[PDB]
Design an enzyme around this catalytic site. Structure first.
Site, PDB file in Angstrom:
ATOM      1  N   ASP A   1       1.532   2.453   8.930  1.00  0.00           N
ATOM      2  CA  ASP A   1       1.222   1.714  10.155  1.00  0.00           C
ATOM      3  C   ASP A   1       2.296   1.943  11.208  1.00  0.00           C
ATOM      4  O   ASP A   1       2.070   1.654  12.390  1.00  0.00           O
ATOM      5  CB  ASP A   1       1.108   0.207   9.891  1.00  0.00           C
TER       6      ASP A   1
ATOM      7  N   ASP B   1       6.243  -6.858   4.912  1.00  0.00           N
ATOM      8  CA  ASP B   1       6.126  -7.817   3.812  1.00  0.00           C
ATOM      9  C   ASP B   1       7.115  -7.563   2.682  1.00  0.00           C
ATOM     10  O   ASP B   1       7.839  -8.486   2.289  1.00  0.00           O
ATOM     11  CB  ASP B   1       4.699  -7.863   3.253  1.00  0.00           C
TER      12      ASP B   1
ATOM     13  N   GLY C   1       0.807  -1.208   0.000  1.00  0.00           N
ATOM     14  CA  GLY C   1       0.000   0.000   0.000  1.00  0.00           C
ATOM     15  C   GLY C   1       0.844   1.263   0.000  1.00  0.00           C
ATOM     16  O   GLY C   1       1.910   1.299   0.620  1.00  0.00           O
TER      17      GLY C   1
ATOM     18  N   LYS D   1       8.994   1.803   4.451  1.00  0.00           N
ATOM     19  CA  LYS D   1       7.724   2.466   4.130  1.00  0.00           C
ATOM     20  C   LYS D   1       6.560   1.834   4.876  1.00  0.00           C
ATOM     21  O   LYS D   1       6.365   0.615   4.792  1.00  0.00           O
ATOM     22  CB  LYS D   1       7.468   2.361   2.631  1.00  0.00           C
ATOM     23  N   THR D   2       5.749   2.637   5.560  1.00  0.00           N
ATOM     24  CA  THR D   2       4.386   2.250   5.934  1.00  0.00           C
ATOM     25  C   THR D   2       3.748   3.298   6.836  1.00  0.00           C
ATOM     26  O   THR D   2       4.413   3.811   7.742  1.00  0.00           O
ATOM     27  CB  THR D   2       4.341   0.859   6.633  1.00  0.00           C
TER      28      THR D   2
ATOM     29  N   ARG E   1       1.207  -6.332  -4.192  1.00  0.00           N
ATOM     30  CA  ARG E   1       1.551  -7.099  -3.000  1.00  0.00           C
ATOM     31  C   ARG E   1       2.088  -8.485  -3.308  1.00  0.00           C
ATOM     32  O   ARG E   1       2.144  -9.327  -2.408  1.00  0.00           O
ATOM     33  CB  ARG E   1       0.356  -7.186  -2.053  1.00  0.00           C
TER      34      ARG E   1
END
Lengths: 550, 530
Positions: free
Chosen positions: A203, A174, A79, A200-201, A143
């Site tokens: 979250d 991931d 994402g 990267k994220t 993904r």
């Protein structure tokens, strides 16, 4: 957009060390590393890359591993998070400073682009038009997981066909599991193809003592917090609504917690705490109903509730239910075939234990279906689709009954008008803040320097992110040190361990210290839109999480 | 809150050059005299003492005020909040202080009801200071109490005298301003010197006309919606997999959806007014969306963005018709009675709809249904069949959104900040000239604030007579999207290009520091109209 035209002009700020000539940047080798858990099993899996040391940069004459132009491939994976396009512009600028004939190739649609050799050259004008913009849309992402010898050969082949010296992978836990495994495969087969990862994220679940935060988190929480701020202030204005806000954040509550510290909502649920206290669904309901009641008794028939979208994986009973629906589906793969929701499910209800079926049929009908689909729509890495489960509507429905039952007995005089929200997708591809803009550009610039020193299997790393960018520290973190072993899709696989909210950490302690005051009083904070022009203090602001932790 | 609020509390809203003059050097310009939009005769007799008032406008020049003594002003925030309300109040406060430092401002709490219960607070400088340039109505809160029983107008008058009020300023949408117009006369009818001024508030922008160029809050709320929609567009380009369906607030009109569409270039945007005018069916609307989704799939594009106004189904004549018949006979089987006796024509339509909408239409009977989740449902069905017949090879993964409440109490943009402050400041100057039954008005809103024109629009000219349950009631006609207007025509010229191509625009967060051209930006709608 006129905004777009001006923001395109912003010059991201680098660490002072990365402004030096590249052969005046030398490496400082720190302690060799261990994995977090399952060290034994990870050492034998990662034969060539286990236990690599922390790398820091410092000024000094140092000879590079290339003399001629570089060919670099790059992937946006998973994402999107605000800033990815600056990782790319950082990379582009760095290789050009090294050698103007260097070339950058972007693979399309995530790691799948690499497997299928679907790429485009990232040229100076193309990269110009994306500078400081949100999105992964310069090449798009995906993904796809790389886990088999078949995947690895195609990657090797496709890297060789494009004459690549290195592949930079930008992604979360991931994607960087791909990265670490892929680097191992290359080094194992004596391939001179380097693999660097970038953190990267939104979250913020990809981090440790050296990686202080993942990129995008800053931007996304700022956007979420303003909207949540606006809902709080609208609730104060009309004195009538209970807002239930679900936030993205599959596996961890960093996003919810940051937004709580920013807005002071009346309720924020922290999944990690839920798990630690082995809470049940109905216990959580009781604790929210309780707050709603005391507020109604103060005359306040309104409030704001935050709930992490992955909360359902931290309620042990609901976690059990989903894992069983999983297993019930894995094997009966055949019956399910060409049946509908309505009937796909009769089988489920039928194949469940009386205990789980009792938990299951206890849920609202619509939730029952949603849990079904959450198990169907797992991603390549085996993630349940939770974004898709309307957890905040589960809460609303169950609360309404509980409040009715109490109006029934004349124990609730109040007026309960719920409104549900889910802030998620509208935060992933927003314009990056100045923080993520500088941080991402530095990450990408830094990655090329790791590459120019022959390193592989590293995460690009920038430390002291709370200071002015100029004083930031640059270097590298071996990917294996973030990893453990984890059962995915039935197998025990080596993966990067997601970093969840530390219940012993300062951000959480601080939420705990105040959450009671925030529940019964109206102490809402009202953050504003991200600003890109004005006082450095406002424009270069950072998260509360990052202040509290560093 | 923030170094942001505290930096934003210091901002100085910009006035029209005329309102910076001494109040004795502001003189009136009397324009053409007014008549209602329709029912001109009934309204003239209803609004006996205030009908047919002329357009007012200010210009520089020696004058004479209706007051020398300190003013007592009451003020009400009415209906749903819109960004800038607190600046209407700060503008009012500053104006009456300039006139006479002994003037007092009283805010009634929670809407018109706080008036009926003398439930009020003095708005002192220190308090007003902390609300300057903030979103929300929360300085006194708002509500939707109508003032309609003779007992009401009577207690309202009582309480105005109980507090020694020279004037009451009402900040609200079309209902609230109908209220104020009537209230204005009731006060005149009985020989009381209490002036009532109205202020044009709503994010819907359904309160406006040839003189009222826009209602306040529309600018701020559309900028916030538009960014979020722009962000969804850009997420959609990034992953190449989702169809986002965005419902926007606005049960009545499509000003908000249209504005957001001109700002984002979504692949689809339904305009309720256009649907009504062309008299479209539900399924025709579905076909139009399916046809777009199919064609983009054939291009490799299994993703897109759809904008729909919240009141759309209520503009589908079929549907309206059905809630007519449903209300004409007048769960699971008790609907099936609705079937055999329904006319056919509505029957074939009633059965087009999903059961949860059908059963829902029964729940509507007691009296909501998602404009959003109806379409996604019906689209999924037509695509399922099409894949089953080898006609649709794409993957359709819908996501629904509803942007509304998070736009109403955001920080106002510079535009709404200047516009609202000017509106409130201007209301006082209307009051100081003894006017009543006016809406506070600021024209030329596309120019720089200093070149804005200040004045008053008589509330009765905005009205027709509505009738419901026996009584002919005066009402302000909601202003809907003009299908002959420039904002809509601009959309019609380009929407086909936006459907099959990816020409998304990506607007950014509202900015409050930086170049005038970014910070003082206005809506596309206002540029095209003005």
């Amino acid at each position: 957009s006129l905004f777009k035209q001006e923001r395109q002009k912003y010059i991201p700020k680098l660490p002072n060390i990365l402004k030096k000539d590249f052969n005046n940047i030398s490496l400082v080798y720190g302690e060799n590393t261990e994995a977090i858990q399952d060290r034994q099993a990870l050492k034998e899996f990662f034969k060539n890359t286990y236990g690599l040391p922390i790398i820091s940069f410092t000024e000094g004459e140092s000879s590079l591993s290339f003399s001629k132009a570089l060919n670099i491939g790059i992937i946006l994976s998973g994402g999107p998070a605000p800033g990815g396009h600056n990782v790319i512009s950082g990379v582009f600028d760095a290789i050009k400073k090294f050698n103007p004939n260097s070339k950058l190739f972007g693979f399309k649609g995530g790691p799948l682009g690499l497997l299928e050799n679907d790429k485009i050259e990232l040229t100076e004008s193309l990269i110009n038009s994306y500078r400081n913009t949100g999105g992964f849309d310069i090449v798009s992402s995906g993904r796809t997981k790389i886990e088999t010898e078949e995947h690895y050969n195609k990657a090797l082949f496709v890297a060789k066909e494009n004459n690549l010296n290195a592949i930079i992978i930008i992604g979360g836990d991931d994607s960087n599991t791909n990265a670490a495994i892929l680097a191992e495969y290359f080094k194992k087969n004596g391939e001179n193809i380097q693999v660097i990862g970038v953190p990267k994220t939104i979250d913020a679940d990809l981090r440790n003592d050296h990686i202080e935060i993942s990129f995008g988190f800053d931007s996304a929480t700022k956007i979420y917090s303003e909207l949540i701020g606006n809902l709080c202030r609208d609730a104060m204005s009309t004195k009538k609504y209970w807002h239930f806000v679900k936030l993205m954040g599959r596996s961890a509550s960093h996003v919810a917690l940051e937004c709580a510290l920013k807005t002071h909502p009346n309720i924020c649920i922290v999944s990690e705490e839920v798990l630690a206290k082995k809470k049940t669904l109905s216990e959580i309901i009781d604790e929210m109903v309780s707050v709603i009641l005391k507020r109604s008794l103060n005359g306040d028939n309104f409030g704001v509730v935050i709930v992490p979208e992955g909360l359902i994986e931290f309620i042990p009973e609901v976690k059990s239910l989903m894992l069983e629906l999983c297993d019930i589906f894995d094997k009966n793969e055949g019956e399910f075939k060409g049946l509908n929701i309505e009937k796909m499910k009769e089988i489920f209800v039928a194949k469940l234990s009386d205990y789980m079926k009792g938990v299951y049929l206890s849920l609202p009908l619509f939730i029952q279906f949603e849990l079904i689909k959450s198990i169907l729509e797992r991603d390549p890495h085996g993630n349940f689709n939770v974004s898709r489960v309307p957890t905040e509507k589960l809460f609303i429905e169950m609360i309404q009954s509980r409040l009715n039952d109490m109006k029934k007995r004349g124990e609730y005089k109040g007026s309960f008008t719920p409104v549900d929200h889910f802030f998620g997708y509208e935060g992933r591809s927003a314009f990056p803040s100045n923080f993520d803009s500088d941080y991402c550009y530095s990450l990408g610039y830094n990655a090329v320097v790791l590459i120019l020193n022959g390193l592989t299997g590293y995460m690009s790393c920038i430390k002291n992110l709370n200071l002015k960018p100029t004083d930031w520290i640059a270097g590298g973190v071996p990917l294996t040190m973030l990893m453990n072993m984890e059962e995915r899709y039935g197998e025990k696989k080596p993966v990067i361990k997601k970093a969840l909210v530390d219940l012993e950490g300062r951000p959480f302690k601080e939420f705990v210290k105040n959450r009671d005051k925030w529940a019964l009083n109206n102490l809402y904070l009202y953050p504003g839109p991200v600003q890109y022009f004005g006082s450095s203090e406002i424009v270069d602001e950072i998260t509360e999480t990052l202040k509290l932790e560093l």
